[PDB]
């Protein structure tokens, strides 16, 4: 098995630029990795204080005085015990899938492979992180690995859900970078239509009161101004923390600020 670590070009991910201009690994090598984790810093104050306290406890000697206790009680095991458990599990068990697990996995593969088509058609450029049959076999392997922990002789939907969630956290998150704006040929008319629609919406709707997506579609599209990409325009306006809020199961669109 291969465990690899690397940095992007320019050092940081530089979320302002395209994903293809940030990852120098070709599609040939990136298809052989079951899980890819893109790691970023969020610079939050609470997390920074928690990490600072955790790191200072390590240096001042307060680490060991805690750790042994948990390793004693019920929550941690030593390296040698975990090594012996790993070797016992690998030499004793080799689980198998159930008929319902295959049905749940096939639909997830179809969904995650459909999404890539819409993303590639919208961005009019090929995806840097690929989704292939190896990505289905990876989820199968993760399901069986999860089953291996409990020495279970069969893998079921309980393990399938966790494997799917891990795959969504690892690879689908990396694929779905969702660029706010790249100023490329894709959405070229949108470069002005975004401001046009923002002005039309902010003149129609004062700082109070709300509207609906149904009305904001029907009436603003009867004039043939539809672009099929306005789904994320509302979210981008929401990102300003003032223009748009979504409430009531996403039905209600509320004007909250300038």
């Amino acid at each position: 098995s291969v465990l690899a670590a690397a940095n992007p070009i320019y050092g940081r991910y530089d979320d302002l630029k395209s994903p293809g201009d940030n990852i120098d690994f070709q599609t040939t090598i990136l298809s052989r990795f079951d899980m890819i984790f893109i790691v970023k810093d969020d610079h939050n104050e609470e997390r920074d204080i928690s990490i600072a306290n955790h790191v200072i406890n390590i240096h001042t000697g307060n680490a060991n005085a805690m750790q042994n206790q948990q390793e004693e009680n019920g929550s941690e095991i030593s390296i040698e015990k975990m090594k012996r458990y790993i070797t016992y599990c690998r030499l004793k068990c080799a689980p198998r899938l159930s008929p319902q697990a295959a049905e749940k996995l096939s639909s997830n593969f179809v969904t995650i492979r459909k999404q890539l088509l819409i993303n590639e058609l919208e961005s009019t450029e090929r995806s840097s992180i690929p989704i292939t049959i190896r990505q289905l076999e990876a989820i199968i392997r993760i399901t069986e690995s999860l089953a291996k922990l409990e020495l279970s002789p069969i893998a079921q939907e309980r393990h399938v859900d966790e494997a799917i969630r891990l795959f969504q956290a690892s690879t689908m998150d990396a694929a779905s970078q969702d660029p706010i704006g790249g100023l490329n040929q894709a959405s070229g008319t949108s470069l002005s239509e975004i401001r046009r629609f923002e002005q039309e919406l902010k003149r129609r709707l004062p700082i109070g009161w709300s509207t609906s997506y149904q009305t904001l579609r029907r009436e603003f599209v009867d004039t043939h101004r539809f672009s099929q990409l306005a789904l994320d325009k509302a979210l981008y306006a929401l990102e300003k923390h003032e223009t748009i809020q979504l409430r009531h199961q996403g039905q209600n669109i509320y004007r909250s600020g300038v």
Binding site: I58, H59, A63, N64, Q67, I79
Partner: protein, 96 residues
């Protein structure tokens, strides 16, 4: 050593004694002294290792006595190695 170590202001004299003939640049001298004395490496439960050495960078205008400070550090250090620019290779600063 133990007699002069208990005088107040020993740190100030140690800093002032770094590269005496160079005038000013007290922050550079403080950084050089801190790098020379160094920190303490650590190992937590034999599975987590923490480095204990200080690295220093000097970015400045030409003619500000950076190279002379490097030569002084080379002279004072117990074990020192010197390299410059294009005269070093990938395996000349590493194992071959």
């Amino acid at each position: 050593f133990r007699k002069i170590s208990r005088d107040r202001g020993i740190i100030d004299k140690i800093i002032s004694s770094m590269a005496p003939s160079i005038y000013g640049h007290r922050d550079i001298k403080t950084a050089v002294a801190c790098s020379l004395f160094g920190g303490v490496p650590k190992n937590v439960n034999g599975k987590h290792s923490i480095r204990g050495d200080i690295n220093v960078l000097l970015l400045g205008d030409p003619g500000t006595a950076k190279s002379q400070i490097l030569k002084y550090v080379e002279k004072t250090a117990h074990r020192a190695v010197f390299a410059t620019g294009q005269g070093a290779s990938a395996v000349g600063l590493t194992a071959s």
